[PDB]
Amino acid sequence: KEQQEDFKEAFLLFDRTGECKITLSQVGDVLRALGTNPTNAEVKKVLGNPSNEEMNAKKIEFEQFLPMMQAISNNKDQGGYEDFVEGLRVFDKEGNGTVMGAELRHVLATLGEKMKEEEVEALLAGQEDSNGCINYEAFVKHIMSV
């Protein structure tokens, strides 16, 4: 119940038009930054796969948000710390634990789903050392906290 109130407070915070109406991206981010990580595929599945126009055409209410959040809370396929560590290990060609920023940049911007460059510069600025290499394990700890 308390988490429901917190989610409603977040929805009220993120309202911009003043109509208490926001598109699906805001709800997706709210769930994303509040204990769950539902990928874009999961978001489409739970929202009926809105198209390019439907994303900003139709909007739902908190009442219809209750069932989808309840269902998503039952999805536990989120990986593990060791799983992420091993997955990142694949790029340690030298075995020294240092991965240059260029390789990870290409991997993220060319493989898998796409992330906006503004998101990259906002979230991935200042942690690069002089040589431009990022410790993947330290990055794992940092992403686990914030």
Binding site: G79, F84, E86, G112
Partner: protein, 740 residues
């Protein structure tokens, strides 16, 4: 790490990053598989989907052909491409080898391992491959560490001879004239690091022992074996040369698309009026049956310049000049033996000559008496008990006798030149621990296979059997070294069926030998006995096949290189080799160098047995050379040609033998560091990982140092890796969004 090779570095290995960066390419393990073709027999294509018996295949050229799903075959993985040794590949197939070789050649990667074999395509461009710095820096490099190269196996054999105190010999197979001479010359040069003497002698033997064939216009019929005798301390001592399995029927009989040995044509050159004058020649090959029987002449290489080279080599060589005239007149006399008539006598089966003028010329050439020659030929004499009896022979018998005499004298002549050149070759230094180099024609295949083709195929069959046995022995040694011993069945009997059908009594060769002894023999009834004794009785023997209106089909066999269909016409006529002893004795009394000079199936059998026994005592190594295209242009490659060459070279047999075992052998450390991410948590770790993967144990064998896998298991783990990394990427994206 590798920069020592300098400018030669890219060709032997591209770079640490070039092959790595090119490694990451798109590919589907389920819908990017190979597809059979019609003209190239194999092409790269992608399948749209699974549609029952029909599949929508799109290739680079652009087509929508369909192939039945039973013969569809997977494609090589991308990260396993450009592999030095095909034995490590996770999908062993006929087109996989062709594609690997073609892409390596395109990327200027010439040499390529195939297990024991070292395939080396011949580019028609200069390379720094033979640069003195390359060989200087390549010395002492082990086989495994160094990139694939003929120098690698040469050094390995040198080290084995030094250590094991055992002889090592190398055998090369390929197409002569496309680089065979260059390959052997560079090999002997690498040992040297008497090259001049070898290169000066080679043209003479080539002229004596080559003829124009349907495919190759400078075929080397005879098998040449060169032994590099070394010293006790592993220092070069001297060289020895021998020739084995020299065909003689080709000397007397020529096929429609074949020519006799280049000698006669070369001498017929007009640019030496004195020799033609003192040979008493009409200068028209059409006048003589021993030459114009087959194809008259071809442009090919210049006969005049070749004869100049041969006679000058004779001049600059150990022996004198008079015997050059002696040998030229002797070969002219051999030519003259194709003119007698010998009509049968009246009211008798005896034969009597008619054109007794070529006999006079032949006698003058050999300085004998024509009357004595005619008397001996017509009424051969033999010693039995303690007396002598003379019996006559019909025209066919004397014709066979004279043909056999000509073949025998030519063989003795060739042996005499071999002995003379060998004697002139070596020096006084002590000889020890020879190293063998063998040059022999490959498993040729034509549309009109005949007796000579059968003999060549049989010899290649024996060589392939020896290779298979050596492979089995080496594999058994390796497995016992690793504490693994299962399914250790020798491969000899797998190929022994054809050998038994060929050589063993009541076999094909034995049947041919015993049949012609019967007074009345004909080809049709010979085929009748063959069918009665082998049709159904022997698995390898089976009914022939007629395709695309081939000239003829009499009987077919299943060889190591595939189904081969032979012909029967003319075999009986040219198989017989009756040697007249009295005429040989007459030569023994002749006044010439002939004193110093002096069925085919049996002689071939005994010579092959002798050669195999000789080779069994030396540790073998093997080299393969393959032409990339029919045309002389580089880069371009004719896939059917390369596939046929690979089929005839036995490489496919080697890879097939390797496949039926457990070809993939990988280190535990690399497997754990590159494949443990599937189910993360070395005996316990590896066994746990393989148990959790839910894979039947029978598909792999577990060891203590190296883990043994089948071809398909690596591919299965590959799509498992692809799925796991896709899931990892999705999870990483989800977590990053969680941070946001």
């Amino acid at each position: 790490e590798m920069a020592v090779f300098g400018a030669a570095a890219p060709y032997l290995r591209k770079s640490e990053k070039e092959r790595l960066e090119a490694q990451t390419r798109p590919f589907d393990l389920k819908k990017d598989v190979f597809v059979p073709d019609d003209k190239q027999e194999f092409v790269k294509a992608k399948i749209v989907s699974r549609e029952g018996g029909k599949v929508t295949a799109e290739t680079e050229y652009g087509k929508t052909v369909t192939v039945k799903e039973d013969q569809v075959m997977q494609q090589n993985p991308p990260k396993f491409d450009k592999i030095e040794d095909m034995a490590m590949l996770t999908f062993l197939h006929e087109p996989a080898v062709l594609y690997n070789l073609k892409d390596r050649y395109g990327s200027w990667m010439i040499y390529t391992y195939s297990g024991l074999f070292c395939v080396t395509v011949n580019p028609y461009k200069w390379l720094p491959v033979y640069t003195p710095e390359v060989v200087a820096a390549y010395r002492g490099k082990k086989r495994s560490e160094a990139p694939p190269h003929i120098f690698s196996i040469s050094d390995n054999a040198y080290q084995y001879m030094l250590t094991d105190r055992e002889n090592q010999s190398i055998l090369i197979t390929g197409e002569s004239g496309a680089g065979k001479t260059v390959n052997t010359k560079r090999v002997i040069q690498y040992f040297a690091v008497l090259e001049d003497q070898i290169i000066q002698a080679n043209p003479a033997l080539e002229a004596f022992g080559n003829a124009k064939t349907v495919r190759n216009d400078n075929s080397s019929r005879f098998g040449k074996f060169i032994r590099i005798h070394f010293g006790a301390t592993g220092k070069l001592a001297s060289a020895d040369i021998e020739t084995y399995l020299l065909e003689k029927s080709r000397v007397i009989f020529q096929l429609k698309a074949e020519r006799d040995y280049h000698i006669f044509y070369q001498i017929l050159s007009n640019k030496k009026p004195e020799l033609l004058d003192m040979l008493l020649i009409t200068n028209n090959p059409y006048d003589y049956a021993f030459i114009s029987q087959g194809e008259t002449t071809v442009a090919s290489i210049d006969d005049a310049e070749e004869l100049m080279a041969t006679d000058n080599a004779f001049d600059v060589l150990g022996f004198t000049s008079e015997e050059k005239n002696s040998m030229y007149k002797l070969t002219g006399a051999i030519m003259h033996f194709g003119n007698m008539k010998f009509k049968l006598k009246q009211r008798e089966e005896q034969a009597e000559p008619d054109g007794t003028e070529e006999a006079d010329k032949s006698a003058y050439l050999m300085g004998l008496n024509s009357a004595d020659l005619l008397k001996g030929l017509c009424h051969p004499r033999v010693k039995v008990g303690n007396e002598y009896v003379t019996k006559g022979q019909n025209v066919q018998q004397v014709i066979y006798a004279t043909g056999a005499l000509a073949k025998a004298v030519y063989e003795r002549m060739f042996n005499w030149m071999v002995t003379r050149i060998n004697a002139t070759l070596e020096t006084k230094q002590p000889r020890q621990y020879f190293i063998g180099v063998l040059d022999i024609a490959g498993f040729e295949i034509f549309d009109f296979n005949s007796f000579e083709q059968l003999c060549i195929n049989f010899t290649n069959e024996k060589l392939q059997q020896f290779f298979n046995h050596h492979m089995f022995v080496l594999e058994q040694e390796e497995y016992k070294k690793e504490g693994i011993e299962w399914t250790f069945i020798d491969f000899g009997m797998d190929l022994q069926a054809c050998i038994d059908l060929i050589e063993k009594p009541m076999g094909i060769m034995s049947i041919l030998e015993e049949e012609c002894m019967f007074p009345k023999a004909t080809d049709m009834t010979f085929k009748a006995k063959l069918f009665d004794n082998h049709l159904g009785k022997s698995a390898n023997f089976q009914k022939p096949r007629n395709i695309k209106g081939k000239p003829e089909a009499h009987f077919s066999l299943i060889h190591y290189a595939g189904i081969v269909d032979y012909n029967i016409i003319g075999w009986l006529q040219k198989n017989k080799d009756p040697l007249n002893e009295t005429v040989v004795g007459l030569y023994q009394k002749s006044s010439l160098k002939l004193l110093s000079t002096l069925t085919v199936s049996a002689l071939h059998r005994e010579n092959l047995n002798k050669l195999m026994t000789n080779l069994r005592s030396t540790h073998p190594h093997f080299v393969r050379c393959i032409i990339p295209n029919e045309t002389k242009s580089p880069g371009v490659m004719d896939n059917p040609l390369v596939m046929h060459q690979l089929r005839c070279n036995g490489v496919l047999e080697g890879i097939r033998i390797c496949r039926k075992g457990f070809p993939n052998r990988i280190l535990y450390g690399d497997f754990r560091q590159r494949y443990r991410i599937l189910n993360p948590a070395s005996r316990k770790g590896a066994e746990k990982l393989l148990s959790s993967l839910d894979i039947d144990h029978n598909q792999y064998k577990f060891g203590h140092t190296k883990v043994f896998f089948k071809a398909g298991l690596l591919g299965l783990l590959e799509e498992m890796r692809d799925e796991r990394l896709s899931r990892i990427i999705t999870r990483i994206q989800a977590q990053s969004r969680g941070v946001l």
